[PDB]
Design a protein around this motif. Sequence first.
Motif, PDB file in Angstrom:
ATOM      1  N   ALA A  95      50.249 -37.831  31.003  1.00  0.00           N
ATOM      2  CA  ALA A  95      49.460 -38.164  29.834  1.00  0.00           C
ATOM      3  C   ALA A  95      50.286 -39.031  28.911  1.00  0.00           C
ATOM      4  N   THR A  96      49.606 -39.897  28.166  1.00  0.00           N
ATOM      5  CA  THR A  96      50.252 -40.740  27.162  1.00  0.00           C
ATOM      6  C   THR A  96      49.704 -40.388  25.777  1.00  0.00           C
ATOM      7  N   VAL A  97      50.592 -40.379  24.792  1.00  0.00           N
ATOM      8  CA  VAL A  97      50.180 -40.207  23.421  1.00  0.00           C
ATOM      9  C   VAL A  97      49.519 -41.512  22.971  1.00  0.00           C
ATOM     10  N   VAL A  98      48.227 -41.436  22.666  1.00  0.00           N
ATOM     11  CA  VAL A  98      47.475 -42.639  22.206  1.00  0.00           C
ATOM     12  C   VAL A  98      47.064 -42.547  20.716  1.00  0.00           C
ATOM     13  N   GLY A  99      47.307 -41.378  20.129  1.00  0.00           N
ATOM     14  CA  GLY A  99      47.079 -41.147  18.706  1.00  0.00           C
ATOM     15  C   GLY A  99      47.752 -39.868  18.248  1.00  0.00           C
ATOM     16  N   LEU A 100      47.827 -39.700  16.933  1.00  0.00           N
ATOM     17  CA  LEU A 100      48.480 -38.541  16.329  1.00  0.00           C
ATOM     18  C   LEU A 100      47.616 -38.185  15.155  1.00  0.00           C
ATOM     19  N   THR A 101      47.360 -36.895  14.959  1.00  0.00           N
ATOM     20  CA  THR A 101      46.648 -36.436  13.766  1.00  0.00           C
ATOM     21  C   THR A 101      47.230 -35.087  13.457  1.00  0.00           C
ATOM     22  N   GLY A 102      47.976 -35.022  12.354  1.00  0.00           N
ATOM     23  CA  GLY A 102      48.620 -33.793  11.911  1.00  0.00           C
ATOM     24  C   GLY A 102      49.597 -33.208  12.914  1.00  0.00           C
ATOM     25  N   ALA A 103      49.308 -31.988  13.345  1.00  0.00           N
ATOM     26  CA  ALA A 103      50.110 -31.272  14.313  1.00  0.00           C
ATOM     27  C   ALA A 103      49.607 -31.514  15.745  1.00  0.00           C
ATOM     28  N   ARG A 104      48.692 -32.469  15.914  1.00  0.00           N
ATOM     29  CA  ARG A 104      48.051 -32.692  17.204  1.00  0.00           C
ATOM     30  C   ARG A 104      48.311 -34.071  17.792  1.00  0.00           C
ATOM     31  N   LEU A 105      48.275 -34.129  19.120  1.00  0.00           N
ATOM     32  CA  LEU A 105      48.358 -35.392  19.859  1.00  0.00           C
ATOM     33  C   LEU A 105      47.042 -35.747  20.493  1.00  0.00           C
ATOM     34  N   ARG A 106      46.602 -36.992  20.298  1.00  0.00           N
ATOM     35  CA  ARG A 106      45.493 -37.539  21.073  1.00  0.00           C
ATOM     36  C   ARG A 106      46.088 -38.052  22.397  1.00  0.00           C
ATOM     37  N   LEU A 107      45.649 -37.465  23.508  1.00  0.00           N
ATOM     38  CA  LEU A 107      46.206 -37.754  24.824  1.00  0.00           C
ATOM     39  C   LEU A 107      45.202 -38.390  25.767  1.00  0.00           C
ATOM     40  N   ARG A 108      45.700 -39.269  26.630  1.00  0.00           N
ATOM     41  CA  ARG A 108      44.886 -39.884  27.678  1.00  0.00           C
ATOM     42  C   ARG A 108      45.630 -39.736  29.001  1.00  0.00           C
ATOM     43  N   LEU A 109      44.928 -39.268  30.031  1.00  0.00           N
ATOM     44  CA  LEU A 109      45.518 -39.169  31.367  1.00  0.00           C
ATOM     45  C   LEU A 109      45.641 -40.554  32.007  1.00  0.00           C
ATOM     46  N   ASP A 110      46.882 -40.963  32.227  1.00  0.00           N
ATOM     47  CA  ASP A 110      47.132 -42.259  32.844  1.00  0.00           C
ATOM     48  C   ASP A 110      46.354 -42.402  34.160  1.00  0.00           C
ATOM     49  N   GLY A 111      45.666 -43.530  34.326  1.00  0.00           N
ATOM     50  CA  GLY A 111      44.936 -43.818  35.545  1.00  0.00           C
ATOM     51  C   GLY A 111      43.461 -43.493  35.428  1.00  0.00           C
ATOM     52  N   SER A 112      43.061 -42.895  34.310  1.00  0.00           N
ATOM     53  CA  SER A 112      41.645 -42.650  34.046  1.00  0.00           C
ATOM     54  C   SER A 112      41.156 -43.526  32.882  1.00  0.00           C
ATOM     55  N   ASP A 113      39.859 -43.523  32.620  1.00  0.00           N
ATOM     56  CA  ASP A 113      39.302 -44.353  31.542  1.00  0.00           C
ATOM     57  C   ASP A 113      39.579 -43.764  30.148  1.00  0.00           C
ATOM     58  N   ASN A 114      39.020 -44.399  29.117  1.00  0.00           N
ATOM     59  CA  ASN A 114      39.195 -43.924  27.740  1.00  0.00           C
ATOM     60  C   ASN A 114      38.102 -42.972  27.238  1.00  0.00           C
ATOM     61  N   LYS A 115      37.304 -42.416  28.147  1.00  0.00           N
ATOM     62  CA  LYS A 115      36.111 -41.658  27.723  1.00  0.00           C
ATOM     63  C   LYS A 115      36.326 -40.151  27.682  1.00  0.00           C
ATOM     64  N   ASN A 116      37.481 -39.712  28.166  1.00  0.00           N
ATOM     65  CA  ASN A 116      37.804 -38.292  28.162  1.00  0.00           C
ATOM     66  C   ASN A 116      39.157 -37.993  27.502  1.00  0.00           C
ATOM     67  N   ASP A 117      39.447 -38.603  26.346  1.00  0.00           N
ATOM     68  CA  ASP A 117      40.698 -38.261  25.634  1.00  0.00           C
ATOM     69  C   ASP A 117      40.617 -36.814  25.127  1.00  0.00           C
ATOM     70  N   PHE A 118      41.758 -36.135  25.127  1.00  0.00           N
ATOM     71  CA  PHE A 118      41.814 -34.735  24.738  1.00  0.00           C
ATOM     72  C   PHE A 118      42.934 -34.582  23.737  1.00  0.00           C
ATOM     73  N   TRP A 119      42.847 -33.538  22.922  1.00  0.00           N
ATOM     74  CA  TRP A 119      43.823 -33.321  21.865  1.00  0.00           C
ATOM     75  C   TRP A 119      44.570 -32.019  22.101  1.00  0.00           C
ATOM     76  N   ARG A 120      45.883 -32.066  21.904  1.00  0.00           N
ATOM     77  CA  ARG A 120      46.764 -30.901  22.069  1.00  0.00           C
ATOM     78  C   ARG A 120      47.732 -30.778  20.898  1.00  0.00           C
ATOM     79  N   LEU A 121      47.930 -29.540  20.436  1.00  0.00           N
ATOM     80  CA  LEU A 121      48.957 -29.227  19.456  1.00  0.00           C
ATOM     81  C   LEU A 121      50.337 -29.522  20.010  1.00  0.00           C
ATOM     82  N   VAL A 122      51.263 -29.904  19.140  1.00  0.00           N
ATOM     83  CA  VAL A 122      52.637 -30.185  19.565  1.00  0.00           C
ATOM     84  C   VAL A 122      53.358 -28.922  20.035  1.00  0.00           C
ATOM     85  N   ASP A 123      52.784 -27.748  19.726  1.00  0.00           N
ATOM     86  CA  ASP A 123      53.345 -26.465  20.197  1.00  0.00           C
ATOM     87  C   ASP A 123      52.436 -25.826  21.281  1.00  0.00           C
ATOM     88  N   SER A 124      51.583 -26.650  21.904  1.00  0.00           N
ATOM     89  CA  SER A 124      50.722 -26.215  23.013  1.00  0.00           C
ATOM     90  C   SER A 124      51.528 -26.035  24.301  1.00  0.00           C
TER      91      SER A 124
END
Length: 209
Positions: free
Chosen positions: A52-81
């Motif tokens: 996964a690549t960090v494509v955004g940041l919001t507070g304590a969370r990362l906007r993530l995208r799975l490399d090799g897939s499109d931009n339609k299923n980005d998911f967000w994870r806490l930095v302590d996830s």
Amino acid sequence: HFTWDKYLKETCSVPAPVHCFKQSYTPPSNEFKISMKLEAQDPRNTTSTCIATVVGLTGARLRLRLDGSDNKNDFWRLVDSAEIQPIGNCEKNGGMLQPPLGFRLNASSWPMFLLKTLNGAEMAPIRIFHKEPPSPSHNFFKMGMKLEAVDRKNPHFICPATIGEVRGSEVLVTFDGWRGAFDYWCRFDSRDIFPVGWCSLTGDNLQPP
Ligand SMILES: [Cl-]
Ligand SMILES: [Cl-]
Ligand SMILES: [Cl-]
Ligand SMILES: [Cl-]
Ligand SMILES: [Cl-]
Ligand SMILES: [Cl-]
């Protein structure tokens, strides 16, 4: 402007206490940068570990995208996830990374894709992955208590929500103003629910009802 203080007053409601949640009382610091790569379990096939690549940041969370897939299923994870790990973690433990669901190439191309993706990539440093906060000992939640929950239609946002029902270790999360839409069950230790005020504490995106 939405304020939890006024909202709780207006709705004659009360917040779930902070001890109900698997969230640190002091939010974790976020030292990730956009473009850093890491390992993450695929939100649509959680058995698989992907890049996964960090494509955004919001507070304590990362906007993530799975490399090799499109931009339609980005998911967000806490930095302590626990659902994110540093590059190398999987192989160190004798595992193999897997292509993301919706990988744009064929299966046979995944190993090439993984190699070329990682070569010259900025790996997120091992040190910036935070241990998860402790779980509560049991389900402290009570029907009607208010909280914040990740917006299930668009996880960019976090929304005021209410506990709809408690069953054993599970709670029914209901989104205020949504008239039952996107109601869902989660365990009390879910990382997708937060005490009231966690968005303003951490600098995240609170979507008013
Ligand atoms: Cl806790
Ligand atoms: Cl590691
Ligand atoms: Cl190759
Ligand atoms: Cl890339
Ligand atoms: Cl090179
Ligand atoms: Cl029960």
